[PDB]
């Protein structure tokens, strides 16, 4: 009965960063400030959010439609397996059911990135032109563009990206704002206003 007026308010987010990312610390920080698959219910600014920690598989994963946004975590510092994280992302972001869900990237470990950038070349791991290897802004815009340009023929859906340290509270405000902007651009179609 009254469950319909809760399920009608609900936002679903799919969380699917790799095992070496900050994901376990992120879910722990989220749970205190507000076997396999897990499913977390919380509320931001009086909107109920459900966040699904999927098991990290043919089209029965299509039960992840009606997800509003996909949240991806990558450890930016681990240049040796950044290519594996980027191939994992490429199998997600180009699936037909995820044609109308927005993508959020957190580049995690950026407090380790600002040290490793002074110690080792990023260009030694990649084909593309990388600029001078000792600058933060250049490794940041290089990694962001390398993930971004891995999209195939992207239209209608936005992709968002942010830089994340050892864990902090503001991540829930970032994913709220990207979801809000994803739903504003959906609402324009529902309002016959697009």
């Amino acid at each position: 009965s009254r469950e319909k007026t809760y399920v009608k308010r609900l936002v679903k987010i799919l969380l699917l960063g790799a095992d070496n990312s900050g994901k376990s610390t992120f879910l722990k920080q989220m749970r205190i400030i507000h076997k396999g698959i897990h499913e977390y219910d919380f509320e931001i600014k009086n909107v109920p959010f459900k966040m699904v920690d999927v098991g990290g598989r043919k089209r029965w994963f299509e039960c992840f439609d009606s997800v509003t946004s996909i949240l991806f975590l990558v450890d930016s510092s681990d240049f040796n397996r950044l290519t594996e994280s980027l191939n994992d992302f490429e199998t997600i972001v180009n699936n037909r059911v995820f044609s109308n869900v927005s993508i959020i990237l957190f580049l995690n470990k950026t407090d380790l990135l600002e040290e490793k950038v002074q110690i080792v070349s990023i260009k030694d791991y990649f084909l593309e032109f990388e600029g001078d290897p000792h600058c933060l802004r250049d490794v940041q815009k290089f990694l962001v563009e390398c993930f971004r340009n891995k999209r195939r023929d992207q239209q209608q859906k936005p992709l968002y990206h942010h830089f994340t340290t050892a864990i902090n509270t503001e991540n829930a405000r970032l994913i709220f704002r990207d979801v809000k902007d994803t739903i504003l651009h959906d609402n324009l179609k529902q309002l016959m206003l697009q």
Partner: protein, 297 residues
């Protein structure tokens, strides 16, 4: 009997040309367009969202306003002489004003519903429920048909023996209400509730909605924020240019009759055909303009 200024107004050559011409153009466009609008909007789309059910009310309201215009065209081609029944004089002056305010009240609901769906995409999802759109439509009629109630009850026809005519709302009686003070109480209450609140709320809702889409700074979808700002800006301009001249001239007439004896009715009557262009504009300005409707056409 009626004053000279009234007898002069009921022989005016501009009213006898302007309203028959403009009404006939409005009725010829807006009957088929509100009847194709609905077919698609209602039987071809479905009342699944709060936006489609406010647009079903709007097109139903206008169609019923457009369908009484043939009585008005005849009454202004004949020189202010009503030939039909006393009952049908009551039915026509109610079907005229109840609908023309219903449009203003419905367009107000769609403005609040977009100020909500754009400015609060997530937070307003409680208020984004079809049941509450149905409630606001029912509340619109219920507010109208109580505030306009007297026009259903009293005889609205008047025998004017100077010119040899019977008028239809074109002249009224001072016994309809107990005193001049009760005319002022009645008319300024129906003005504030049926025009001035709906007007100020509609203009504010669109202004904040256009400014929100212009000030937004995301890179993706700038090409579709502009589409939204263009659609909203045309709707605001169509609402203001149709309803503002007529209702602010009405306020100046009601004041002038009550407190100074004078009249601006002929100016009101002329702005009333500008307010009827809406029934043509609505279908082009809301329905035909949007890709979601155009795709099913």
């Amino acid at each position: 009997g009626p004053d000279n200024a009234t007898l002069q107004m009921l022989r005016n050559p501009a009213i006898a040309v302007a309203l028959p011409v403009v009404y006939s153009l409005v009725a010829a466009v807006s009957i088929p367009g509100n009847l194709f609008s609905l077919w698609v909007l209602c039987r071809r789309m479905g009342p699944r969202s709060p936006s489609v059910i406010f647009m079903i009310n709007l097109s139903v309201t206008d169609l019923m306003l457009a369908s009484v215009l043939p009585f008005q065209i005849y009454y202004h081609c004949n020189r202010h002489h009503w030939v039909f029944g006393v009952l049908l004089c009551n039915v026509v002056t109610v079907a005229f004003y109840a609908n023309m305010y219903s449009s203003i009240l419905t367009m107000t609901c769609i403005s609040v519903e977009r100020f909500l769906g754009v400015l609060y995409p997530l937070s307003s999802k409680r208020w984004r429920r079809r049941r509450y759109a149905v409630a606001a439509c029912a509340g619109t009629w219920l507010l109208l048909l109580t505030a306009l109630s007297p026009l259903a009850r009293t005889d609205l026809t008047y025998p004017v023996h100077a010119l040899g005519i019977i008028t239809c709302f074109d002249v009224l009686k001072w016994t309809m209400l107990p005193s001049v003070a009760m005319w002022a109480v009645f008319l300024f209450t129906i003005f504030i509730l049926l025009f001035l609140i709906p007007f100020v709320i509609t203009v504010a809702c669109y202004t904040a909605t256009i400014l929100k889409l212009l000030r937004t700074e995301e890179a993706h979808g700038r090409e579709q924020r502009r589409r939204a700002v263009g659609l909203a800006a045309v709707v605001l301009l169509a609402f203001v240019t149709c309803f503002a001249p007529n209702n602010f001239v009405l306020l100046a007439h009601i004041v002038s009759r009550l407190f100074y004896g004078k009249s601006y009715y002929h100016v009101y009557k002329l702005t009333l055909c500008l307010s009827c262009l809406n029934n043509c504009l609505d279908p082009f300005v809301y329905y035909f303009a949007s890709r979601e409707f155009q795709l099913r056409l």
